[PDB]
Amino acid sequence: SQFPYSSAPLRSVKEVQFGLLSPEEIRAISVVKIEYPEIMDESRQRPREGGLNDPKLGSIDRNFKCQTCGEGMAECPGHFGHMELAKPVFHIGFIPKIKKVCECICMNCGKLLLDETNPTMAQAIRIRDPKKRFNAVWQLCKTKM
Amino acid sequence: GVIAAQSIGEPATQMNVTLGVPRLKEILNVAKNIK
Amino acid sequence: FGEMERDCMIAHGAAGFLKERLMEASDAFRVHVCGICGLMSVIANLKKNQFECRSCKNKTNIYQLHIPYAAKLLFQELMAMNIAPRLYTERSG
Amino acid sequence: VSTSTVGARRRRAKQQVDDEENATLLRLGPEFALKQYDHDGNEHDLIALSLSESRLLIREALKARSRARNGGVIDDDELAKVTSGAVANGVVKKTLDYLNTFARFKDEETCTAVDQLLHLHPFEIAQLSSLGCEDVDEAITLIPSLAAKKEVNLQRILDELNRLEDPY
Amino acid sequence: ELAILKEERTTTPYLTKYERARILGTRALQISMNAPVLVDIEGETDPLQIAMKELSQRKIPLVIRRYLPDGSYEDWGCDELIVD
Amino acid sequence: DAQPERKLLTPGEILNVFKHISPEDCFRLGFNEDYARPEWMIITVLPVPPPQVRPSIAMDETTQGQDDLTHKLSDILKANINVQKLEMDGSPQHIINEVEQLLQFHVATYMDNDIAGQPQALQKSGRPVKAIRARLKGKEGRLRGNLMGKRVDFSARTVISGDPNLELDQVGVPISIAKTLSYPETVTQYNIHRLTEYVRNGPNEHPGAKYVIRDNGDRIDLRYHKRAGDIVLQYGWKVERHLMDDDPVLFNRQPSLHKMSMMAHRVKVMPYSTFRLNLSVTSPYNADFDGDEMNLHVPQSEETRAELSQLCAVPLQIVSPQSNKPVMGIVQDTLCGVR
Amino acid sequence: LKHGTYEKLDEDGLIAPGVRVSGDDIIIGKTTPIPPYHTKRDASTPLRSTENGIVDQVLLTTNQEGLKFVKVRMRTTKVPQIGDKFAS
Amino acid sequence: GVKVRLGKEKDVVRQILKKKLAREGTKNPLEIYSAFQRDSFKGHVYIEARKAEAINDALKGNVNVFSNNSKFLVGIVEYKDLLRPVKLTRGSYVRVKNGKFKGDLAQVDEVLENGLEARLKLVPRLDYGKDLSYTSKFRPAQRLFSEAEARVHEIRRDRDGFVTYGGEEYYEGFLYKTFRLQNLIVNSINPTLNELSLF
Amino acid sequence: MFFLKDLSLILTLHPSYFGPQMNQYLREKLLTDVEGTCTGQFGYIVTVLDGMNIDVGKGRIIPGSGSAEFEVKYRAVVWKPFKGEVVDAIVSNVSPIGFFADVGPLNVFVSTRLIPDNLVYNPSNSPPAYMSNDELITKGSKVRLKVVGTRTDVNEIYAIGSIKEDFLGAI
Amino acid sequence: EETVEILFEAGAAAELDDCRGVSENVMLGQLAPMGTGAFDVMIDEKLLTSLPADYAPT
DNA sequence: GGATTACACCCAAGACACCAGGCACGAG
RNA sequence: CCCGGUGUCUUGGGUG
DNA sequence: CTCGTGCCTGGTGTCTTGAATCC
Ligand SMILES: [Mg+2]
Ligand SMILES: [Zn+2]
Ligand SMILES: [Zn+2]
Ligand SMILES: [Zn+2]
């Protein structure tokens, strides 16, 4: 009621699917590429394009409308940019899992060190929970040197 | 569920074997070596 | 309205009251989601009445949600750490 | 806005390029799959309609509804005034008049004869009725679907269609 | 499919305190938005009071859809459930 | 025994190896081909959050400082440019080894600045940088501080006093509080005459009203409307009237240890500045009148008024499920006197 | 500009002793110029919203850096009432 | 190579030279040949010798050097890349790095003979003496010099279209002013939206 | 290309409409909103089958707002054209850039580089047409074209034809 | 507890949250399947037909 | 090595150092 | 001529 | 008239070494 009318159907959330954002997808939702660390341009206001405060990312000011959605600052959610890295770096949160993956796969071609021919290992792939299965596999393949 | 949680916790907030809160703590934590 | 207050309303079974307190009487916010990819990536111009999730090339399968602003904020902070929280409005099974 | 029985359309790892609508390649998209489901979950063949079937159903539905609007009390220009609104008046009148100038079998006697004659993918069976043809040579060129099916006897089909066809 | 036939309904035939509270509030809300009222209104003109009057005469036109744990459900009309 | 040569496993080296993992082995590793593909754990392009997440604040007047994330993104962006120039020239392994590791460092402490075993990134002021991970954890973070609980509108608080000449389910509410809080009552045929009287009295005379809300959502602020006499109410509009007799409100005294810390009382407007309670409800709240304060919450719709009166009201709470016995009785003076 | 009244300030930007004040009234008017007429921004100090009383005394002086410096003391009287605390 | 405190690289090179010269001909000479520090390589001094022990000797007691045993070896094939030494043609554009014109695009009209300075053509930022009885944060908006405005409000004609106004030269509306070459950026200049509109 | 489709529409009903003829109001409401409208997913919805007997199901009450939500399942005649489909048409306009042919609800544009050279636009003739030997090309002339591309702007569907191919043209 | 660790681990293993808990719906601001929210309320079209005809929607 | 020490409210008092460059003032 | 809002991070003492 | 010398301002920036017990 405090929301202006919109023709899109109103629904509720039934499921939250977590996951990772692919590099391709990050670019697909981005509205601008970010390159220059200087916020201001010539210090004459009017947010220089490509700045950390490029107006395509959104408005936090009552008098400038968003150049992407046309809505005021109250309704405008903000839109993401993207920053290309010259060299790929690790995500700090996932390092101990990355480490676990290295001992599981071949460091040349990347194949799982055990097969369904191994009887105990064939039992471990049946485990329905992904986390426990992954751990059960790694518990076997760890000693495979 | 919630009614059970409050019904057990509220008396604890006003209260040679171990008794009272230190004994209660051993149970919920399921200590392998009780005092 | 702290965590302990929340529990008391559950015990009373007053589910309707608890919803209203934490939304209409506070920081209620409307977002748009894409019916295909489940992200809050929709660009919505309401006076032009045109919507598009550029990633899915989808202008038809789009839903609106009412969620707390602080939840919208939370999801954008998760996106900034490369975590994708996909909001779907139906149970696949 | 308006939705159908088909649901979710969740993303998959391998993309697909047989979605693009191509009547030659029998690609009718996700909504017009070969096996559909009605509003009770029951299985059902896709309902493609020739020009002759469609003229009877639409005209019947409009006059039965018109009679119902009149508490229970022929020409195309009269039948189109049943709709509500000038936008609705336009699309319905243009569809009847278009069908009025391209439907060969304009009555239910001949139409049921064509119905029994035709009643093998369901889409091809409907295509053959809509596009008039003289000989077998003319059918497999404009429509290559028939050649793949390797179906004998297109003469009988065409001969009966042309014989039932009234003069003009 | 999910719906359970009338003769095979198994849930309790008494209105629960939670069902009662939701019915009274929902019906009250509809009356304040000028829904047609099904009982005579005398002196008691509060929205909640009119809804409580309709409940006492078994005249609220609503159906409870009680979900069971597996997702199936029994529809019960408020006209047929016994209110204490 | 043989001499081993441990070399560094750079992110780029590991990145190429991960893209060659087959779909069938991707599944067996517990990953997921559509949602969590294992090479996506390495960062190649960083999503830039909009200004909503990191707003600017004005310390004193015009002066404005930037959010910790804004400063930290500047550092990542500067460090990114120096890899550009350094990779192309003057890169005899050792030089690269210090620049590239520093880009890894800034991207790490941007997300998590509590990495064990190494010094924290610091602001110029000397205090540690507020990373995204630290934004979400702990009592004041996004989850425990803004989502599992949060500050709310239509609330009030003051010192409480007892009153034996109030009914058990009443609460005495100061006039000043009763003029600040409000309830949006929908206009119908049965109350339109009654509600117009409130509109003429205005926001400063009780019983009065503060706003008139149309179906489109435009509020008319009755403090500044000089032609208040020329308003005619239409059905379906809303009038935010003052709190009045018999309205149910939720009353609450911290800390809420059990469900009878929150019961619905009927409001009785009274002079002075304390909340009044009948003396027999002090026990379930574990309240007394030595300085205690209590909180009042006003439901904002027709549905929740009914929920309060039919589920949470004070007479329904006389017997508690904790020990199948009452939690309220005759207490203090009245109990001494009745003996 | 602030929403409260500015009509109790004298021409020197300072309110004078003896004037009763209520909440949100401005008692010290101060402006800051906007960098690149219509060039300044208000930086005034209003009385705390929950208070009232009488301006009692106004100190005017300069600080260690040589700029102007003011203090305004307000007095009111608090009379015991329902809710006030006491103890032996 | 050796890690040193940022900004102290030149000091360390100096200190090494003093130690070398002071010990020449004694029984304990400092057995280094040279030492140097490249600006492009922050916090790193390079030292030439035959034995690692001489490196430790050169740095002993130096308060600007990190005590951790962090001295790294350079490959012969990387020596020349350590000593690499490395436009502004007339009619080209540069960005000014100092003064009220800091950040502004300018055309490099002339270059000083000694080579020390130059002459730049830039869009002025003037007030025509309006409030006289400047900084880069309290400067005026850019606009071409208007000699009739100067005539009206506050001026020496020199030549066709050339005026000296408040001791600066304006020709056909542009300021011509000398800047040190070290005060102008010649590389990687990105014209702005506004500059594309103007020039 | 005509099909029969089983569709459904979410309808929100304000509580003041809760009367004994609720279903009949909804039946009128469904028809007014759906008939004659076009979508890229299904095409033009021409007429809905069995409108006066549609079973609307039960309405879900929206928590917090009082309004009621019906899912009206229904069956309609729909008309969507397809790329590759050969169809007949009636020309609506003739211009230097091609020809126009109303195919029922909409009109398809055929451009000049996909028209054979021997068909020459003749303005001097009365009435204007393309006059080849033993052929008629005037308004209302049966012509046979093939749909080679469908473009949808979510409001209406635009299809481009071609007459260059074998056996296509006037008959 | 272990707030951030849960969520990182949840991402890396693509966890699906079926939104049946009380806490899930509370923080998303939706009516929780408990008490007054443990069921849906439908409109009894059959019961409305016993009303007189002048009450009818047009 | 990490993990934590119940919940809510109010009051008052502090926020960035070092070096290179230009500009203004004083003396010969 | 409508609308109209200003702060963030810590330290110390209380209240219950 | 021309050179020596002190003050204001902006871009830049890091390091001499010096509370306890559950899983
Ligand atoms: Mg007390
Ligand atoms: Zn926007
Ligand atoms: Zn291999
Ligand atoms: Zn999408």
Automatic annotation (TrEMBL), chain A:
<feature type="binding site">
    <location>
        <position position="106"/>
    </location>
    <ligand>
        <name>Zn(2+) 7</name>
    </ligand>
</feature>
<feature type="binding site">
    <location>
        <position position="106"/>
    </location>
    <ligand>
        <name>Zn(2+) 6</name>
    </ligand>
</feature>
<feature type="binding site">
    <location>
        <position position="106"/>
    </location>
    <ligand>
        <name>Zn(2+) 4</name>
    </ligand>
</feature>
<feature type="binding site">
    <location>
        <position position="106"/>
    </location>
    <ligand>
        <name>Zn(2+) 8</name>
    </ligand>
</feature>
<feature type="binding site">
    <location>
        <position position="69"/>
    </location>
    <ligand>
        <name>Zn(2+) 3</name>
    </ligand>
</feature>
<feature type="binding site">
    <location>
        <position position="76"/>
    </location>
    <ligand>
        <name>Zn(2+) 2</name>
    </ligand>
</feature>
<feature type="binding site">
    <location>
        <position position="79"/>
    </location>
    <ligand>
        <name>Zn(2+) 2</name>
    </ligand>
</feature>
<feature type="binding site">
    <location>
        <position position="66"/>
    </location>
    <ligand>
        <name>Zn(2+) 1</name>
    </ligand>
</feature>
<feature type="binding site">
    <location>
        <position position="109"/>
    </location>
    <ligand>
        <name>Zn(2+) 4</name>
    </ligand>
</feature>
<feature type="binding site">
    <location>
        <position position="66"/>
    </location>
    <ligand>
        <name>Zn(2+) 2</name>
    </ligand>
</feature>
<feature type="binding site">
    <location>
        <position position="69"/>
    </location>
    <ligand>
        <name>Zn(2+) 1</name>
    </ligand>
</feature>
<feature type="binding site">
    <location>
        <position position="69"/>
    </location>
    <ligand>
        <name>Zn(2+) 2</name>
    </ligand>
</feature>
TrEMBL record, chain D:
<dbReference type="GO" id="GO:0006367">
    <property type="term" value="P:transcription initiation at RNA polymerase II promoter"/>
</dbReference>
<dbReference type="InterPro" id="IPR045222">
    <property type="entry name" value="Rpb4-like"/>
</dbReference>
<dbReference type="GO" id="GO:0005665">
    <property type="term" value="C:RNA polymerase II, core complex"/>
</dbReference>
<dbReference type="GO" id="GO:0003899">
    <property type="term" value="F:DNA-directed RNA polymerase activity"/>
</dbReference>
<dbReference type="InterPro" id="IPR005574">
    <property type="entry name" value="Rpb4/RPC9"/>
</dbReference>
<dbReference type="InterPro" id="IPR038324">
    <property type="entry name" value="Rpb4/RPC9_sf"/>
</dbReference>
<feature type="region of interest" description="Disordered">
    <location>
        <begin position="1"/>
        <end position="18"/>
    </location>
</feature>
<comment type="similarity">
    <text>Belongs to the eukaryotic RPB4 RNA polymerase subunit family.</text>
</comment>
<keyword id="KW-0539">Nucleus</keyword>
<dbReference type="GO" id="GO:0031369">
    <property type="term" value="F:translation initiation factor binding"/>
</dbReference>
<dbReference type="GO" id="GO:0000166">
    <property type="term" value="F:nucleotide binding"/>
</dbReference>
<dbReference type="InterPro" id="IPR010997">
    <property type="entry name" value="HRDC-like_sf"/>
</dbReference>
UniProtKB/TrEMBL annotation, chain E:
<dbReference type="GO" id="GO:0005665">
    <property type="term" value="C:RNA polymerase II, core complex"/>
</dbReference>
<keyword id="KW-0240">DNA-directed RNA polymerase</keyword>
<dbReference type="GO" id="GO:0042797">
    <property type="term" value="P:tRNA transcription by RNA polymerase III"/>
</dbReference>
<keyword id="KW-0804">Transcription</keyword>
<keyword id="KW-0539">Nucleus</keyword>
<dbReference type="GO" id="GO:0003677">
    <property type="term" value="F:DNA binding"/>
</dbReference>
<dbReference type="GO" id="GO:0005666">
    <property type="term" value="C:RNA polymerase III complex"/>
</dbReference>
<comment type="similarity">
    <text>Belongs to the archaeal Rpo6/eukaryotic RPB6 RNA polymerase subunit family.</text>
</comment>
<dbReference type="GO" id="GO:0006362">
    <property type="term" value="P:transcription elongation by RNA polymerase I"/>
</dbReference>
<keyword id="KW-0597">Phosphoprotein</keyword>
<dbReference type="GO" id="GO:0005736">
    <property type="term" value="C:RNA polymerase I complex"/>
</dbReference>
<dbReference type="GO" id="GO:0006366">
    <property type="term" value="P:transcription by RNA polymerase II"/>
</dbReference>
TrEMBL record, chain G:
<comment type="subunit">
    <text>Component of the RNA polymerase II (Pol II) complex consisting of 12 subunits.</text>
</comment>
<comment type="function">
    <text>DNA-dependent RNA polymerase catalyzes the transcription of DNA into RNA using the four ribonucleoside triphosphates as substrates.</text>
</comment>
<comment type="similarity">
    <text>Belongs to the RNA polymerase beta chain family.</text>
</comment>
<protein>
    <recommendedName>
        <fullName>DNA-directed RNA polymerase subunit beta</fullName>
    </recommendedName>
</protein>
